[PDB]
Design a protein around this ligand. Structure first.
Ligand SMILES: [Ca+2]
Ligand SMILES: [Ca+2]
Ligand SMILES: [Ca+2]
Ligand SMILES: [Ca+2]
Lengths: 143, 15, 13
């Protein structure tokens, strides 16, 4: 992981680790949530800490925080790959992948498909039954 | 309501 | 053709 990304994830961690001791406590997390309009109980805060606290000592340290942030970054990079794929297929940018668009891009990607093959692919994905693949449908097929 | 850390981080960046 | 290849193909392109 790049040191630029570490410094970035450190700035994020510092929003929770409000005193820079290197740990996020339930008390700190309580202040965070209160600052955003909630008023959590000790139990609720222990639950939230436990989402990230890998060694179960009841606090989150920066290595545990960074493990979580790196997993989320891989999720966001996957999501961005699928979003870019949708833009490439949606040649005219109207939010729908048509059969014509699917066939034309597949040709460019080294896969020559016939009409019936393309139509079967659209039916597999076309949850709402309108004959085209919108972004929501695409995500469902691609995840 | 039962928020995840991701939303929390987003809102913290704002304020 | 599965959609997973189409993602892989796109990545190479
Ligand atoms: Ca602290
Ligand atoms: Ca810990
Ligand atoms: Ca389109
Ligand atoms: Ca549809």
């Amino acid at each position: 992981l790049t040191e630029e990304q570490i410094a970035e994830f450190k700035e994020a961690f510092s929003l929770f680790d409000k005193d820079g001791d290197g740990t996020i406590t339930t008390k700190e997390l309580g202040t965070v949530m209160r600052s955003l309009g909630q008023n959590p109980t000790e139990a609720e805060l222990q639950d939230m800490i436990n989402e990230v606290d890998a060694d179960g000592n009841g606090t989150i340290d920066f290595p545990e925080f960074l493990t979580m942030m790196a997993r989320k970054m891989k999720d966001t990079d996957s999501e961005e790959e699928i979003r870019e794929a949708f833009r490439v297929f949606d040649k005219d940018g109207n939010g729908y992948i048509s059969a014509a668009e699917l066939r034309h891009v597949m040709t460019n990607l080294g896969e020559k498909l016939t009409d019936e093959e393309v139509d079967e692919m659209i039916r597999e994905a076309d949850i709402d039954g309108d004959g085209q693949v919108n972004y929501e449908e695409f995500v469902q097929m691609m995840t | 309501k039962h928020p995840k850390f991701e939303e929390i981080l987003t809102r913290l960046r704002l304020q």
